[model samples]
Target: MIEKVYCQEVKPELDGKKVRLAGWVYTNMRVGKKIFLWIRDSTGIVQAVVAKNVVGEETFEKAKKLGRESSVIVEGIVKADERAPGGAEVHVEKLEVIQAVSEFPIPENPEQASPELLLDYRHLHIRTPKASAIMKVKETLIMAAREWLLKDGWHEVFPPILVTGAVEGGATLFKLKYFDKYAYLSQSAQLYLEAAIFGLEKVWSLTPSFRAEKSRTRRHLTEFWHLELEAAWMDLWDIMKVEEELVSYMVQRTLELRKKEIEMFRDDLTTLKNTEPPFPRISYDEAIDILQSKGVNVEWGDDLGADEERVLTEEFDRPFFVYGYPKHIKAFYMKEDPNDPRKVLASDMLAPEGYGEIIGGSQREDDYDKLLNRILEEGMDPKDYEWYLDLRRYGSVPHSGFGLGVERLVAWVLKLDHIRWAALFPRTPARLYP
Candidate 1:
């Protein structure tokens, strides 16, 4: 048995060297008596030429009969071919159909299938080039995020998915029965990350968050990954700078590491290349002014909807921050602005090009009495958050953190049509399978 190499591993430097390649039959073309098979694996695609005279009659006949998406192993010699993909082709000497796929539903031209049908057959659809490229970019984004944070002395922590209370609110919580007590899936790891920050000074987590929102938008997902970060002794301004720097680092890293994948998606690299530090910071009042100038009907106290965010983002070319929203419109844990009690020191980072609100963060309230009062005012039982309030009771320092929606960030960076493409198995309001 010959050692198998992936389609991407074959190089022109190994010309005339015998190598075994294993992958699915992407496509097959016949030029008179000679056959060319495009083989696709996880890494990449390569052309395998099967000549009747080179591979003998038996092997050539087997190669011609191989069906689309059929699992195949080809033992061949690597040959330099400028016309072939990746500038190399395999001249097959032997071929074996490992597992023949006789009835592949995924079309040769992937666009032939409807979006719904493609998602329904996502397991197979992901094997396509575009989907694979998006996934590779997403992986690079996540790895870059972890690398950026870990290199900055941020300790990575794993918070429980099941929680006793909602960090944001109860409206979009997924409740479940936990033994004798009732529990709910975590909406955000913000609270736990805040707790960890006290002990570790700087802590972060990449975890799944569940929401029961009934939204059917391109940006909404029932389950999504969150990159949560919390740092003690940091104010809202300090955290905002950190966010700007982190995003800049991730974008630069992606451009450096995944250049081919980015180009594969046909994304204009200029959009990402311009993602440097010092992202514009606009106050809530300024955002409202921008929206009103654009004829959007939004009030100062009201939350910014997707349309309003889109209108505001039109003025910027990179991710920008909208801060100091009305206290009532934000979470109860957000610190109130002392200068103006009506607003909270919270900020939402909206991605440019209509990808809105990739991150939400705030300086947390360190005053025990004020936090307890806010909790009560929001109609949430303080008893449930007694342990949380204890942080304020004993030696509390100003802490700030944020939750970056992983899929949202990926979609924005890749300029994807929908957030579903960023997830391996997306969980949306209308999808839960494949």
Candidate 2:
């Protein structure tokens, strides 16, 4: 039996050790008859070298025939070589063709491939170092975020995807025919989580939310993973601080743990390095002035356009939380800003580098009168939202929560150009396949 060692674990100190390395061949280089084969396991890449004289004619020819992305196993002795990928090379004693390529070569040159073609053959695309590295970076960010929330005494809770009531407006919703009545896919878990919050003091849910918006922007995905947290007594200030600290932790931890992935993928680590806690805070009125100066023709009561959001993101060097949106523009459940009766105590956390609206949060309307007024003003049935409003009746303190798009966060952290590419299965308005 051949003792197996992963490519990532192979080191210079392990020189003269006999081992079997198995993985897909990443790439190969031949310099003056010295063949270098870069092999990749799930973790990372390592170099395996085969010289004609040392490995004999038959083995040398077989090594030469190994194509890029082909699966293979190398029975070899580890050698300390400064020129190798990880500063250690494998001197091949034997080569086993575990899974040879039986079809055409890779369809596109990874360095210069178009996204459309790469996405078409996404299976092959992710095999490249850059693509694989992005996945590693995403893993780091998500794991750290989940760990931080769990440590903060947040219980992970799951709500049903199929529901009876319309949580929000009928627009931007996807409906399905269920036996007798139509069932709508959840657009957001706000109401469900809010109801769950009454029973459980602190709860969080990370799940998919669907929207039928025909948006063609690089950032919007029809079906996206959303992370939401609701607490019975947490205030807007507390929620904002949690968001800022959580974001800081994710960026810092990702940079620390996924350093090699970042460097390998050539992602801009500047965003992570410059991410500091207590990000800039601005009010809705202040943001409008900033936008107006930038030639954005918008009034106080309107929603901020994508362009306006981009401007706000550019204004701040790091993440910024902008609060106090007009009540009419925000969801009905948001608490009204007492300072300005017309505005709601809502905010959006804008990530750096044009990643707009990573978070949407607000102080909920705990007052039954205000909640009812807002619900009626929005033309939504109060009866349908009875359970949601009941929380306010049963000792709802000035609580606030937020919804975060997982793919959006992953894209920004990994520096992927598009949010769709960041998800394992990209779901868009017109496409949903492997």
Candidate 3:
């Protein structure tokens, strides 16, 4: 017998070949005397046919009782059938119930289940084909990102989850009681990785980040993963180029590698076909003008809302990076554009399908006076960021970096509706149940 062949491995070419498969029984249907069991594993799903005559008395009895979500192992000969689910089926010769299901049925029915029901029982929900397909796409995105980072000579690092607090602000920090002083979950690795860049020059991190926002939106999540990259001696434009290229590469790689998974999301593989370098650049002013033309009533200094972003992104086929944000609205660390003091050299990469702001990066303010003035003006205590300011005071080099919300990117690629669906154990404002 073939050693633990995946359901997907039972191809038309393997007709009459014997194989062993094990997985949760997704759903079993009986047509008069014939039984068809849809066995699902991580790889894929295939139908297992069990006729009364094919499997003797003992096997038939076991197959008869196997319901949805039952764990079983079956040895069978692959048979090609035009009407079969994957164009092939496994004719069971031997069957064993590795783990028999006694009581609790799958919380959500595979068919006719609402998103809320699925989310409530997300652990068991993931066993379904559609939910599993979303995860497969997410895996594809991570692999593509890792491939691009490695090729770009970025050293991957895992930052600690337990930290002092949100260095940026205490407002959204999840407070925890440390040994002596109070500690909090890290909101972002911006400051920590910035320090790392001083030594490694170019580094990338994929780590979990937390925020303590009270309200919930489709975009906001209390706990999510962040993919951040810090680079030394690179200005804003250099970082912008890297951001677009990285996104394009991930899109292209997914289109190439995850053909089946992409198909499952109803995404056109050709949408990522473009290999053009330096994605179209639109400035904040340009975006405002475009939004006004589209009948959105927004002013110059205001931040772009979700609706505004959606309209702008829909105007472009490929992922577009918008730059030159108003200085007052952005973080204090961003370097002000020399030509226009009112605007900062920061960019937001908006992915396709209205996935707003996957990447946010900026050129660091290297000048000591300018950075210090901005920090003080923002009401931040200079003492908290004294070491950060020292980088500018001592030997400052033009540096830039961006933080990509990993779950958001993965969600967009997978066409998932809620950001919480992407995380394994998502924590929102009031929903913390594992």
Candidate 4:
């Protein structure tokens, strides 16, 4: 048995050199005396030529028995061909059938498969070229995020998934019983990240967050990954600058490293190439005015839902920030604007091309009395947040943080129609199976 090489690794450099390759059979065709088999691996696809006369009748018969998606290993010599699937081909000298696929559910034209059927057979559907490309791009996106944040002096932290209180609000919390006491799945790691920023100066976490919202929209997920960051001694403006820089970096890095995958998905490279810093910023009042002008019938102090965000973001060519939301519409932890007591110093970064609100961030309230008062006004028990108030009581500096939905970012960058495609095993309101 020769050392196995991946399908993508059968390059021109190894021409005429014997190698072993293992992958699933993508396609098989017989052209008179010549039989061509296309094999697909994680890296890519390559053609393998098996001549009936050269390989003998017995081996040729064995090759013909292999079905689509059948697991097989072939020992062959690499050949450079201009018309091959990947500009390279292999001349098979020996063959071994690992596992012959009886009846593959996925068809040759996977795009023709219905979305419901694809979801039902997700394990096999993910092996399709389109799904594989998205997964590769997703991996690169996460790697770029980690690389940028680590270089910016942000310490990576793991916040608790099971929490005693909800950071956002109680309405969307996923409550569960932890031993004898009741606990809730964390909707956001903002509070824990804030606590760590006091000691670490800057901290970040890429963790799973759960929400029990009963939404069946393309944007909502029961469980999702969040890239959250917090920094001490930083105001809302500083945090906004960081957000723009980070987002731009992720886009540039993806364009640099995952260009092949991006092109495979037919994504517009020009939009991503032009993604830079200094996104436009609009106030809540301006957003409402624009919505009303566009016949949305939105009023001030109303939370910008999916429809409103889509309408507002469609006017911009790149991601933009919507800031200064009404205090009544935002979370209690967000700091209120001192000059304008009616609004909070918060922002939501809406992605371009109708993919809205990838990120939500705000400057946190550092004043002990004001934070406590806001909590009480929201009907939250102060005893549950005594530890949170303690940070403000002692040495509290101006701080800011934000949470970016990882899947949302991927879907927007790839221009995917649905958010579920961005996740490996998406957990939606109606989905929780293989």
Structural similarity to truth (TM-score) of each candidate? 0.97, 0.93, 0.92, 0.97
lDDT of 2 at 377: 81
Full-model lDDT for every candidate = 0.89, 0.81, 0.81, 0.89
What tens digits encode model 4's per-residue C-alpha lDDT throughout 1-434? 55679887888888899988889898888966788888888988889999987789998988887779989898889898888877789999987889888589987787788988888899998998888889888888889989999899899999999888778889899888788899999999999998898789999999999988897999988899999999999999999999999999998999999888888765477667767988889988889998999999788988899999999987788898999999999999999999898999999999978899999999999999999999999999999999899999879999999999999999888888899999888888888888
Q: List where candidate 4 sits over 4 angstroms from the true fold.
A: none
Worst 10 residues of 3 by lDDT: 102-111
lDDT of predicted model 4 = 0.89
Kindly list the per-residue Cα lDDT of model 1 for residues 33-139, writing each as its tens digit. 79999898888888999999888888787887777899998888999878878888998888888887767888888788888888899998888888888888888
- The local lDDT score (0 to 100) that residue 306 gets in candidate 3 is 77
lDDT score of model 3?
0.81
RMSD (Å) per prediction: 1.3, 2.3, 2.4, 1.4
The true-versus-predicted C-alpha distance at residue 159 of model 2, in Å, is 1.9
lDDT of 1: 0.89
Writing each residue's lDDT as its tens digit, candidate 3 over 160-223 gives: 7887635546778898788878777888888777778877889989888888888788877988
Model 2: per-residue lDDT, tens digit, 1-434? Answer: 65679887898899888878989887777978788888888877888888899889987888787776778888889998888777788988788887666342344357576777677777777766677777777778879889899888888888878865665567788889999888889988888888887777788898889888788888889888888888888778889988898888888888889887777644567767888788889998999999899888989898987778887788877778899898788877888878788888889998878777899998888998878887888888888778777877887777789988888887777667788877776878767755
Displacement of residue 189 (Cα, Å) in model 1 is 0.9
- Model 1 residue 232 lDDT score: 98
Off by over 4 Å in 1: none
